[PDB]
Design a protein around this ligand. Structure first.
Ligand SMILES: [Zn+2]
Ligand SMILES: [Zn+2]
Lengths: 63, 64, 51
């Protein structure tokens, strides 16, 4: 689960060379569906995603 | 508990960057430069050291 | 001594009116969804959608 109440069962452990690597060299760590969002409306998960990225890129800790 | 040897996402050896991280933070660096000056460039590695609560100094107090 | 709620521009199944008045109700568990109830403006045909 995340902290916005959106459980996800572990379905398949996908090997790392198959993961979509980014432009910065990073593979992801957990792939999450866009199809848990329109019915459940967790905007807080998107802002937590942007905020955790902007906090790990700066050393900060965000309120 | 204790710092993981490899970073979780991409396996950079980050286990040898914990005592030298506390050393940079006691020498008045900021955490945006104590993760820069250790060679942690991608935010999947900077995640691993910034957000790490070293939970074994509290755990070794209960020592025989 | 009405207007039956807010409208959304959705076509009715029977009469083909361009809008249907809607009302939400979270009828499932807290795990998933929000069940949306529709009601047409003219002929009052009520169907429900589960998302
Ligand atoms: Zn890494
Ligand atoms: Zn109708």
């Amino acid at each position: 689960a995340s902290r916005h109440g959106q459980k996800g069962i572990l379905s398949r452990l996908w090997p790392a060379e198959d993961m979509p690597f980014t432009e910065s060299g990073m593979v992801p760590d957990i792939l999450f569906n866009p199809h848990g969002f329109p019915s459940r409306m967790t905007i807080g998960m998107l802002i937590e995603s942007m905020a955790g990225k902007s906090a790990a890129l700066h050393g900060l800790c965000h309120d | 508990m204790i710092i993981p040897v490899r970073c979780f996402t991409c396996g950079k050896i980050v286990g040898n960057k914990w005592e030298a991280y506390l050393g940079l933070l006691q020498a008045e660096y900021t955490e945006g430069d104590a993760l820069d000056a250790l060679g942690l460039k991608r935010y999947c590695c900077r995640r691993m050291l910034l957000a790490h609560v070293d939970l074994i100094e509290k755990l070794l107090n209960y020592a025989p | 001594l009405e207007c039956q709620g807010p409208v959304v521009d959705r076509r009715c199944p029977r009469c083909g009116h361009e809008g249907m008045a809607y009302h939400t109700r979270q009828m499932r568990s807290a795990d998933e969804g929000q069940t949306v109830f529709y009601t047409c403006t003219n002929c009052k045909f009520q169907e429900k959608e589960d998302s």
